[PDB]
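Title: Request for sanity check on Dehydrosqualene synthase prediction

Description:
We are preparing a figure and want to confirm that the structure record we downloaded matches what your pipeline produces today. Could someone re-run it with the sequence below and paste the raw structure tokens into this thread? We only need the token string, no images.
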Amino acid sequence: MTMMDMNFKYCHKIMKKHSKSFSYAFDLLPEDQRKAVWAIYAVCRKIDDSIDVYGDIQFLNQIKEDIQSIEKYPYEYHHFQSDRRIMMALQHVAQHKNIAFQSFYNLIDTVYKDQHFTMFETDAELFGYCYGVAGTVGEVLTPILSDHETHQTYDVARRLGESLQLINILRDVGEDFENERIYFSKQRLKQYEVDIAEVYQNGVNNHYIDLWEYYAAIAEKDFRDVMDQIKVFSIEAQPIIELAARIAIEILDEVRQANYTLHERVFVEKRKKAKLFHEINSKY
């Protein structure tokens, strides 16, 4: 085990902890690809968690500066300010692959704006947030997951990231509410006569189910569109992407089976992910 191996192993730990749903899929990639996913994912996660973990924006500012250092001087040694293990790994990836640095900057800008967990007025704002926190991740991952640097490959990856984020939202309504977060837009809440606090107290009702299903239908359509374009990804990444999309749909079915509960964290069993992969990988 080298120092660089340890940096990547730490990035892996961050992804395994914070994407319990999807880590399993990305870990099926070939070694060099999954390691790059770990590093990029870990940077993004450290950005997203930073204001809550530290209680201020210092670490966030440091991370931005470290990323800027890598962008400007990818081959120079930096004394990183934020988390040296994740930045050394990101720099290693950047020395081998084209990184969309502006996507990291867009993510950082979004996390800063979202720091009070302010409610979104319209779905357009909700989906703008989904771009900022997850579409950006898909953009940065694009050269790792594909050999095509075409606009539609970035577009499919961006949509995949945003759709995975909408699944996270749909899975985590109760847990998010406990943490002072509601992602559904004010406009849609009003249209469907839903108050999340009220639902948290008094249980699911048909209006809440209709609202949740409105967003689930969006996610499912966007996943179908991603799958229609699965061949934009490298042959090695295709079954992994298909598996992440299948796990996503399975999460929606788990939520439905649990009667859309706000009081449990539903999830797909590791053993079930293996079954889903067996079905998928047998096509490849």
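Thanks, this matches our download. Residues 67 and 87 are 8 Å apart (CA to CA).
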